[PDB]
């Protein structure tokens, strides 16, 4: 009931299945590709030069300014905002350095309070922020 069940009816079932996959959004997103026209370019981590420092603020109800740097990428020569985690840390980054960017960890989309940006800075100058924030490595 509600489908072909008969012995010879395997063309109807196989071909109808191919149609119904295009309703599913995960098959649709993979196949369209559709991913290339992205700043990340489908790469988890990207690097390049800092343009400057920007204050972008949270939506609602959370009143807070977040401090995300603007970063030009190496490979595309695009520009994109990118969050800087931990308190301080904007002071540690320095102007016009190379940084390694990675994703917000939400497999796309925009994460917390913070709209727009989908990116966090993992390293600066080949060191890593956690080491820097903790202060068991140095910058000149």
């Amino acid at each position: 009931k509600s489908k072909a069940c008969g012995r010879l009816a395997a063309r109807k079932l196989r071909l109808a299945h191919k149609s119904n996959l295009w309703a599913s959004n995960a098959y649709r997103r993979s196949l369209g590709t559709s991913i290339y026209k992205t700043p990340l370019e489908g790469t988890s981590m990207a690097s390049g030069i800092v343009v400057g420092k920007v204050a972008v603020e949270a939506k609602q109800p959370n009143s807070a300014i977040r401090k995300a740097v603007r970063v030009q990428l190496k490979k595309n020569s695009k520009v994109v905002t990118a969050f800087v985690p931990r308190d301080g840390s904007l002071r540690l980054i320095d102007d016009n350095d190379r940084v390694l960017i990675a994703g917000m960890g939400r497999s796309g989309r925009s994460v917390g309070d913070l709209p727009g940006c989908r990116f966090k800075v993992i390293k600066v100058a080949g060191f890593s922020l956690l080491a820097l924030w903790l202060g068991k490595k140095e910058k000149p």
């Binding site: 010879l8 009816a9 395997a10 063309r11 079932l13």
Partner: protein, 142 residues
């Protein structure tokens, strides 16, 4: 009778100072009686001409009777699909040479068996007909 520029000739035969060469193809086929009393030559016939039959032996219903001494079969086979536990009807159009010994209408099952390439498309040759009367577009598995 010999219409075209070249003289059509039964090979492996010398007039000397009619005859006809006829061949038993074997594999359980009766070499039909109308081959032994008919003016046609054809080197691409199994019985009269010089083509040896060998390998795979098919059956299927005739579609076309349009070309000179060539027909088209469709072999008709089920394909099991693993996922859906269920078959589907498939087919395959196999063109095949005919002897003017046979008398073949549209829409009748034949047998064929393969030989050397006679063209691009033709690699098969008719060895036995059953008549049928009276159509095509039935799906028939053998």
């Amino acid at each position: 009778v010999q219409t075209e520029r070249a003289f059509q000739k039964q090979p492996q035969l010398f007039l000397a100072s009619k005859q006809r060469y006829v061949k038993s193809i074997g594999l359980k086929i009766e070499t039909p009686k109308t081959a032994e009393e008919r003016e046609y030559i054809d080197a691409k016939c199994p019985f009269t001409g010089t083509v040896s039959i060998r390998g795979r032996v098919l059956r299927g219903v005739v579609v076309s009777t349009k070309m000179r001494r060539t027909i088209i079969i469709r072999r008709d086979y089920l394909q099991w699909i693993r996922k859906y536990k269920r078959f589907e009807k498939r087919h395959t159009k196999i063109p095949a040479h005919i002897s003017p010994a046979f008398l073949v209408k549209e829409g009748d099952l034949v047998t064929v068996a393969e030989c050397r390439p006679l063209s691009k498309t033709v690699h098969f040759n008719v060895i036995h007909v059953k008549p049928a009367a009276v159509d095509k577009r039935q799906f028939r598995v053998f």
